[PDB]
Enzyme design. Structure first.
Site, short mmCIF file in Angstrom:
data_model
loop_
_atom_site.label_atom_id
_atom_site.label_comp_id
_atom_site.label_asym_id
_atom_site.label_seq_id
_atom_site.Cartn_x
_atom_site.Cartn_y
_atom_site.Cartn_z
CG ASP A 25 -1.96 1.33 1.27
OD1 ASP A 25 -1.63 2.13 0.61
OD2 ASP A 25 -2.58 1.02 2.89
CB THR A 26 1.99 3.68 -2.74
OG1 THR A 26 0.33 3.77 -3.49
CG2 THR A 26 2.62 2.31 -3.41
N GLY A 27 -0.25 3.98 -0.38
CA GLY A 27 -1.20 5.45 0.38
C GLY A 27 -0.65 4.97 2.04
#
Ligand code: G53
Ligand code: CL
Ligand code: CL
Ligand code: CL
Ligand code: CL
Ligand code: NA
Ligand code: NA
Lengths: 99, 99
Positions: A25-27
């Site tokens: 999850d890059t967020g």
């Protein structure tokens, strides 16, 4: 590997001796894992996203194996609906977003 | 580009002629933007984030530019802590995760 995004980018991780499925999850600034015990010291933290905030335990210097790659760093433990591998550990396995 | 994750993967988007900042978020199924005006009809949608479920407005077939790449697709409008570009539009701009 190259993981496309047609589907959720779920991988197997090993943490605290346990196998789990988690989202790359890059967020997420930090990694957040559903309730489990981890050894060592921890401190309380509040983290917020869509829907508001949850209270978590912050454990530092925890080793995860992420799709076969070991990384060490902070893990937040609390009532997240999904296990999330956040940027603090994605950097350690050399993950990038490419387009 | 090849985007590393030591910092938040923030990009400029253009929607309704306005420039905004948004987070490329591989852990989001959907794109969610803060309150703004969009054309056309909307439909209801409930999405579940880390802190619980919220109601948002779903607008389909909206033109949006992301980091200079053109996309046309669904944008959810509602109370998110930051604008997030989710997989529905990350796939349109050809994004993958790599390690
Ligand atoms: C601050 O120190 C830190 O490092 C730290 C601090 O705070 C954080 C920290 C870490 C993670 C979160 S988060 O999980 O809330 N989140 C942040 C973004 C909303 C900015 C990560 C998201 O990828 C989240 C990940 C997700 C996925 C599923 C369920 C719940 C969450 N996805 C999400 O909300 O997506 C929604 C839009 O599409 C739909 O598809 C999925 C749900 C919905 C928040 C704070 N980290
Ligand atoms: Cl860390
Ligand atoms: Cl690097
Ligand atoms: Cl940009
Ligand atoms: Cl779409
Ligand atoms: Na520790
Ligand atoms: Na409107």
């Amino acid at each position: 590997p190259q993981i496309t995004l047609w589907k959720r980018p779920l991988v197997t991780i090993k943490i605290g001796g346990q196998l789990k499925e988690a989202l790359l999850d890059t967020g997420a600034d930090d990694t957040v894992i559903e309730e489990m015990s981890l050894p060592g010291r921890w401190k309380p933290k509040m983290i917020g996203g869509i829907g508001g905030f949850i209270k978590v335990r912050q454990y530092d210097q925890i080793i995860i194996e992420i799709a076969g790659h070991k990384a060490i760093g902070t893990v937040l433990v609390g009532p997240t609906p999904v296990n999330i591998i956040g940027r603090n550990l994605l950097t350690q396995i050399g993950a990038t977003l490419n387009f």
